[PDB]
Symmetry: D3
Subunit: 289 residues, 6 copies
């Protein structure tokens, strides 16, 4: 029952964003509900097909922490924990890789591919597309080893951009070999920001389960729609557990040269379309300042 | 004040049409009000930039009958008329070409180019892009010569598609040489359909000053949103003066292989966006049947 | 302690085979011991790097039946069996895909990649590279359904050959969607022959755990080094359980246009090099006749 | 009745100039008689086809001052004059553009195209090929505004050279938008020199209605066949009204890097061929010194 | 002392021939005086540079009968003769190849290369560019073997056209292997016609030591400037010893699809330029009829 | 009678060298016995086909001193000698060029081409592929002129690499023009090293008639399998007449950037294969140090 002139206004408003994005890379960190509820996940897959059919170049990075825990429990693999961290033994790494690449990534490739021959699954292992470096975590303020977990080290930017030039949507499971060929599991938020910077992405989108960034949670009036890196970096020691990784990734990407990073509400159906192609978006847009 | 979920629905509905149009040619016959009121004309130019920034390949064909008459009166060139037709003397042809290519086309190239280096003006004279063949008209049921007017004869499909592959939007003024190099003026509606067929266009759009096709004017309930060629060809001897050329062009194009032709309401702001990227459109869609 | 002139003779003997294979596809069915003992598996990976560094285009197809059974037992998933066949429920399919693509294929990609950025893992799901069609099996001479198992239906030959032209070695896990997007598990021997035919491969190699084809097992003197399709098809109803699938795949590939198919001894270190680059080989070579 | 050995000598003498010009751009300023008498104009068009069929890349820049005045008088548009200059109102600009691009350029495109699909008409408006900057003129030694007239500001060298690489002969009407999109009329002599410098032309040719450059008009013995920029710049304050713009353009182009500039006698049939492919030429050749 | 307007007429007359030849192959049989007198040979080399610098694609085929005889006498190699034919022993073949490719061809490559990096020497041996088939000759009306002499059998048209596309002028010495790799000497006139047909040449030029074709030698009034294949084939049994091979080659080439073949006066300086770029030429032009 | 596992070991040992050489240039100086005994020469030709069919890019440089002397004696051309050097008169140069390019090079092109359309003969004259500069020699410690002999001056690296990219094996006869077009004969050892450096070759191979480099001839225990440039340059004033040119060429090439140079035993059948694809080789390998 929607009037024609309203349809026209919504469509026309996409023009400056289509201009900005045409022929550019967009890295999208996929996770949370958008990946659990069927309506949200089918809409997310459709939105990747949408970007491809505008001449835009999406790259999807996904996680799967809860799926990994679920499979480890099904296999009866007792975990060892340091602080809040499971130690990633070689056994845990094999399960993580098999879950992320062999199950979670598979769901997204198939959903996207209902729309066309677009998606292709990859890890850092394939064609040496990226490497990992082992990382410690701080437990009680002391650096602590927790096994085969790492950060992205180097990215085969040319090989990655060749795949995207071939018209493919890479669906990335974040595992990668270190310099000695030992595969590590990389946090998908930190990986998304590293890939965005390495590929020269125009935007980085990170789907979360909240409306946006509250600077003084739980004050409702502290929600912000736009913020620059300087202001944001001052509030990062203030933020709550959950938002800290998403914010750190937005900061590293935009300071690393990505023109804008977006923390968007993955509970909103077609949140990717709303963030990219409306003026208001549906979350918090981060830019340099 | 428009809710996010409504913005999402309008945007998401474009997906099947972006899939269908990506990398395809769309010929758009530009005329009437869309070319006279400033808001409509700036929106039309913006919509050509829109298609280009989705990876779609627009080709604009324009007329300018009233501008030609206006200039002939300013020059004091007395016309000779047979039935309702001005005879196109060599003098009239020179004025028509100078108005269409040197004024009317120039307005559209500049408007479009406010958005980027897209538009390029051309006639059939440039690079022998298409030729004309002289045509008679029927006056009182007898074939009548009215000077240097013609139909499109042959199209340099390769050279045309090369220009479009270069990322340009051709803005076409319909003049063209015959086999002896004598330039003729071609009716812009018939030319648009000839170009659409020659280029293998996915759609032909024809902007008119009415909501759509009324099959039994003035009965309001005879308006139709979709119709096939068989049904439409049976009503063409019934239709009113104004709709006949637009309908004949839709019939020739779709029978000539163009999957769909559209008679759309040029009085609707961003009518091109509404016709292409909504399910309902804003006019009459013609397909084979 | 090997004399120079002997080294020269072995190397020189490779010339006619390098001529025949340069720029050609070779599909290699990887399985059995060559995939279990560490020395054999590292040699197999090195041989894929060898072919790549001669300008040859290897494509590896692998199975993993025993790994799938092992994982199903670890998960406590009770199987239902018809004749000798496990029914592939949707649950069993998910485990099979996660084992084949997320563990077995991963081992080979990494081993190969110790030599360079060559290997890339793929299934039929990625970029719609190939499709599956559901297959029944004969149990007591009646066609029997055993769940989500299939044959290769169609192959995206162009997209596959593009990946190989990019200098990559595809490591193929044989899962693929049917026409409705439902993923099936395909027997890796039948898949290797289908891929070989579809890609226009020069040779198909199938690694087994025996010296070659005995036409009258267990008679030692019935081993053959070369045989044509006509003679071989007459003995297929005679052969033993294990050799039947390998022989059927060789027959379908060579009749399907692949110049030669090879059943080679995967227990021989560097068996791929020996089969391709010596006159005698190390198994049974099948050609049309 | 011309002896064979004389034909051979004339042809052979072209060799060093064909070597120098092969694959190079030549900008030709077309105007005066060469554009008014039918024999001269058909010969000029034939010479553009000649250069194209030697692998040379001509670019034609034309004026049309007298045609513009003629049309303004036919329309009854009263002019306002400052010194010797007509003020270019928005009305005058529209007429100038419609005359230059819609009539004058059209004649040349058609003449050239009698020889092949070579010529294409363009202004700075098309594909943003070049921009204009507003210019004052000195009237009684004080800077004076005379409306929408300008100099070439920037040139889309890549897009221009792409058109020429496509085998086309651009026929340029010198109108162009300023940074705000407002179209200006540019003096065709100054534009030709700007285009020559921007495209890296090997030569700039300027057709005039005199044998060449007389350094002390009217002394017959002051005619010169070659002169360098240093000597020429010293005589520019000495020269007569008519030669000053042609000389200033030759100076700016050759100092701007064009190896040679030529003021040639447009009254000589095939003057372009004579200047380029004989040692003596038919005018004055300017080089750096 | 030649007037400008005469220079213009000679140059302008080349236009239809430059149009016809642009981007086309011209095979030129080089021999006789044009290869002995220094002025003629330097002019011939300059004319090959001329064609290259018009975008034309010359291919030079040369002989060297007298040079071969001279070298055989210097080596004291006694000849055996059947009728008028020297038997080409393996020894004679080695001398012929070393003279033609190692001396005669070398002179032309160097002369041409004074003008640029154009010429490249080749025989049928190089890259298997063409093969030979052994030929008998008729001695007293009986077929007679005279050793390792042959006709062109097959031509590597693609490899030849690749060399010419690279901007090179092949200078061809007519030796070539038979199917068993045994090199034969091929008559350069017959080879030129075979190469012209194989490459799809626009013209074949054959330099001789006479004004043109006299149909009734020695009657001065029997000289002809143009003749078709039908008329010419009727006079071939009439012609004199010397003209027969040149005429047979023109007939085979034009009947084989080459639009025109030319027997031209190699004693005329720059005869190639005169034949190609004047209406009258300097010899006899053969076309189909 | 060679066991399979031995064949496998020899083949597998080639892998690191195929990796190092894939897509790289190898310059091979061909001379001595490898060019005189039929078995050695056919094996050398087969080895050039081998490298080509691994994706390696061989370039063959040959000499022919003894063949030149033999031909000069057959022609009765009295030589003039300064020290041990024949003065290369213009006559001697013509014979040298005709022998090297017209006989010696021809043998190798044909032998190689028994394997495919690979070999192409060239000198510095063809396409100006390289130039020569005149060189004096030291006779009794005073610089002495000995006619038209020279060193390589400059190399058309792009044109050379284009030929090799086309899949051809250049067979180079070392003659080349100086800056004035006068052709000189260049020592083939010095030329091979100059070409290797200019083309960025991975290896330079020089075939000699000895096992390798003896540092204290005739002490059998002074033979060395590997040596660096620093150690080698200290022994060059110690070495014997024959080895000095081969050693000087290895030194200039490796210091000039070629990773390794090899003096190998041309009396060993398939010595090229043994040197490149075994760890031990068959001679002396020189590297920087
Ligand atoms: N959270 C926001 N305020 N988002 C605004 C997004 C604006 C624009 N669509 C972009 O992609 O940058
Ligand atoms: N007048 C109509 N019913 N139009 C429907 C248009 C549907 C679709 N957007 C198309 O471009 O074909
Ligand atoms: N089992 C055999 N007889 N094998 C012979 C193999 C011969 C050759 N290397 C080939 O790849 O075809
Ligand atoms: N006015 C002259 N002197 N002209 C000489 C021209 C020489 C030569 N054809 C050139 O294009 O540069
Ligand atoms: N012998 C002759 N009549 N020659 C005329 C040659 C005409 C023209 N130049 C051509 O190349 O075909
Ligand atoms: N004379 C020697 N030691 N040679 C060793 C050669 C090693 C290796 N095949 C190479 O090409 O470099």
């Amino acid at each position: 029952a929607l009037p024609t002139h309203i349809k026209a206004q919504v469509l026309a408003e996409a023009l400056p964003w289509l201009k900005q994005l045409h022929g550019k890379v967009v890295v999208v960190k996929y996770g949370g509900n958008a990946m659990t509820d069927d309506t949200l996940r089918r809409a997310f897959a459709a939105d990747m097909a949408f970007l491809r059919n505008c001449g835009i170049h999406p790259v999807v990075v996904h996680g799967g922490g809860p799926q990994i825990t679920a499979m480890l429990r099904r296999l009866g693999i007792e975990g060892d924990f340091k602080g809040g961290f499971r130690v990633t033994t070689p056994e845990v790494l094999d399960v993580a890789r098999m879950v992320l690449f062999g199950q979670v990534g598979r769901e997204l490739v198939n959903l996207i591919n209902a729309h066309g021959p677009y998606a292709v699954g990859i890890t850092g292992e394939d064609a040496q597309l990226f490497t990992a470096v082992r990382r410690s975590v701080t437990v009680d303020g002391v650096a602590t080893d927790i096994g085969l977990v790492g950060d992205v080290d180097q990215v085969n930017t040319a090989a990655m951009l060749d795949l995207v030039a071939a018209g493919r949507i890479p669906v990335v499971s974040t595992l990668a070999p270190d310099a000695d060929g030992v595969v590590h599991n990389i946090n998908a938020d930190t990986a998304a920001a590293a890939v965005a910077e390495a590929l020269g992405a125009e935007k980085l989108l990170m789907l979360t389960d909240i409306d946006g960034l509250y600077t003084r949670w739980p004050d409702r009036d502290s929600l912000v729609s736009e913020i620059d890196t300087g202001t944001l970096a001052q509030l990062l020691p203030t933020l709550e557990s959950g938002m800290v990784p998403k914010v750190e990734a937005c900061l590293r990407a935009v300071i690393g040269g990505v023109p804008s990073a977006h923390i968007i509400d993955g509970r909103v159906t077609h949140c990717v379309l709303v963030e990219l192609f409306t003026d208001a978006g549906t979350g918090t847009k981060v830019v340099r300042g």
